[PDB]
Amino acid sequence: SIDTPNYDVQKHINKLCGMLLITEDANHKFTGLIGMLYAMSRLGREDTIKILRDAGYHVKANGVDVTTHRQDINGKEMKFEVLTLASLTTEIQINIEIESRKSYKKMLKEMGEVAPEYRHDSPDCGMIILCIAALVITKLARSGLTAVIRRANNVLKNEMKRYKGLLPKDIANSFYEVFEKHPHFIDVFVHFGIAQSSTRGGSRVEGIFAGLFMNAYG
């Protein structure tokens, strides 16, 4: 049973990436999986199922939809937008949102209203996560972990400055873990990276990803 998110939940998964990126001392246990979900939502359900079946994997495709979950947090009833994921519980998703809202309020207290580039909903959050995945893929092509961190601190210096939760060591470990545990994600990531690196222009981060991905050959 593999979750195959479609184009419709790409905005949601990007926001989930962003919520972890704004979290001070964020727990990156699920970042490898969330990053992979973002890549699949970019490829689309159709292409994702095609890649897995072509790679010889047998797949039970799980539809990914946005649902509203009502949960009581500190006496107050709260509405949370969650994704129907077999790989990621409602509880985990909500706790990611709770912890990021705590970090966000601390940011308001520090600098007032937050600039677009410092928010959890900045359009490049998913790609920022996938830049670490691109570095891990190079070193798999866990000894190369120190080199991933050192290459990450230089290439993602502006992004690390923007996001308190951009912790290269934790994110790289999460990707190493997911690629070891679920090797079918390597095939998904590689097809994602080939397709992405063909797109012209776009954002600074889309450009950094393309350069990092191209480096896995030369």
- The footprint of ligand MZS (CB under 6 A) covers 19, 22, 97, 100-101, 104, 120-121
Smallest distance from ligand MZS to CB 12, Å = 12
Phi, psi of 46 (to 5 degrees): -55, -55
Please check whether residue 58 is in contact with residue 131, taking contact to mean a CB–CB distance below 8 angstroms: no
* Number of Cβ within a 10 Å radius of residue 108: 10
Residue number with CB closer to ligand MZS (2 or 16): 16
Residue number with CB closer to ligand MZS (60 or 70): 70
Smallest distance from ligand MZS to CB 30, Å = 16
The dihedral region occupied by 25, where left means phi > 0, alpha psi between -120 and 50, and beta the remainder, is left
Residue number with CB closer to ligand MZS (23 or 196): 23
Breaks in the chain (C–N > 2.5 Å) following residue: 141
Smallest distance from ligand MZS to CB 120, Å = 5
Nearest residue by C-beta to ligand MZS? 100
**CB-side neighbour CA atoms (13 Å) of 111:** 8
Residue number with CB closer to ligand MZS (101 or 169): 101
Smallest distance from ligand MZS to CB 90, Å = 16
Strands (E), the chain: 2-3, 61-62, 66-73, 76-83
- List b or e across 45-68, with b for residues whose CB sees 16 or more CB atoms inside 10 angstroms: bebbbebbeeeeeeeeeeebeeee
Euclidean distance between CA atoms 218 and 31, whole angstroms:
27
Residue number with CB closer to ligand MZS (61 or 98): 98
Smallest distance from ligand MZS to CB 95, Å = 12
